[PDB]
Design a protein around this ligand. Structure first.
Ligand SMILES: Cc1ccc(O)cc1
Ligand SMILES: Cc1ccc(O)cc1
Ligand SMILES: [Zn+2]
Ligand SMILES: [Zn+2]
Lengths: 200, 200
């Protein structure tokens, strides 16, 4: 809509169901369909036994790994795309994966120059949704794995550390989630946010 | 595949992809497509920090929740379907979800009478594959989520606890995985396996 529409159709054709081998492929990566309620039960177990902040890191890093892999897929489809066209593939794959409906708001990107400032709308976040099913409204944003995805995708695409934060979140009782991504240097508590992406 | 193509077709009508709202639904359960490499990363951190047995518990229970939800879906499609044809939806759903290719070996089931004896072949288990990439070959079977699913699905379908175990597995170097399920009592170590399906 309109680049989103082409993006979605372009990338949705890389998604493949190999039922003969019990497998689902997205580009070169094997995928599974997982119940959000099952992932939600795991999350509750982690939060109850390891604590909110350790569980938050576990999921952010899982999201990070997903993002890096989708960026590797986006790179194989470089041919004939602007830097924005390649960036947009992240929102599209996240949407195709059923994780969240992503709408890019303002995107400033130039990979060779190391330029990146990105704001995105998130609707129907599976994560904020299922977190609020189990813990009720939280006070801090809670789409941990989703934020990890954006951070991994964009960092892999730019070749430098790009961190994201939710400025608004359904898990906090907002109409929607809203995110901002920019280089580590432009974040007040940057090195504390980067620390979350390393194994504890 | 004879009764399996039927189930696979019949149950594919229940899988809805809507990039319109960034969601995916299987029956009345919301799903996400998740990279097995991302699930692998999570598993590595859980095993390394919590220990292999406590991590095994978390994955078995996540699988259990998935299997229970899918048995709920199979129940809504019992219109003219024998006990076996309903049992079979489990292996079908597992395959559609890209977890593993399942082939029923021999299945004895009567839901009314509380009798169940079932043996299955597992080809291309995602879980065994990703485990050997994160840890190398393991000494004991490793398809934890996949076993939880079988246990949860069958138990919910029978209305009695049906436990499974892997008699062989790719995670141990074998060409494929192979499993056996029967009622709790009929396992000499049944009650201890049951302990694994309960959170702290
Ligand atoms: C770059 C990006 C990727 C995913 C996402 O949800 C938002 C933005
Ligand atoms: C009943 C069942 C369900 C799933 C599976 O993988 C095997 C057997
Ligand atoms: Zn959110
Ligand atoms: Zn196995």
């Amino acid at each position: 809509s309109a680049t989103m529409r082409d993006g979605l159709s372009n990338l949705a054709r890389r998604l493949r169901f190999a039922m003969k081998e019990g497998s689902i492929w997205l580009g070169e990566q094997r995928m599974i369909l997982l119940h959000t309620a099952a992932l939600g039960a795991l999350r509750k177990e982690l939060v109850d036994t390891l604590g909110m902040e350790r569980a938050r890191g576990l999921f952010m890093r899982m999201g990070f790994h997903s993002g890096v892999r989708d960026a590797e897929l986006a790179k194989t489809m470089r041919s004939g795309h602007s830097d924005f066209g390649m960036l947009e593939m992240g929102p599209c794959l996240h949407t195709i994966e059923g994780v969240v409906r992503v709408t890019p708001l303002t995107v400033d990107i130039n990979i060779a120059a190391g330029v990146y400032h990105g704001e995105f709308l998130w609707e129907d976040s599976f994560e904020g949704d299922v977190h609020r099913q189990m813990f009720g409204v939280a006070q801090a944003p809670v789409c941990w794995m989703q934020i990890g995805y954006a951070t991994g995708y964009t960092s892999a695409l730019m070749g430098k550390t790009i961190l994201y934060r939710e400025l608004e979140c359904v898990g906090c009782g907002h109409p929607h989630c809203r995110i901002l991504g920019k280089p580590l240097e432009q974040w007040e508590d940057g090195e504390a946010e980067l620390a979350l992406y390393q194994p504890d």
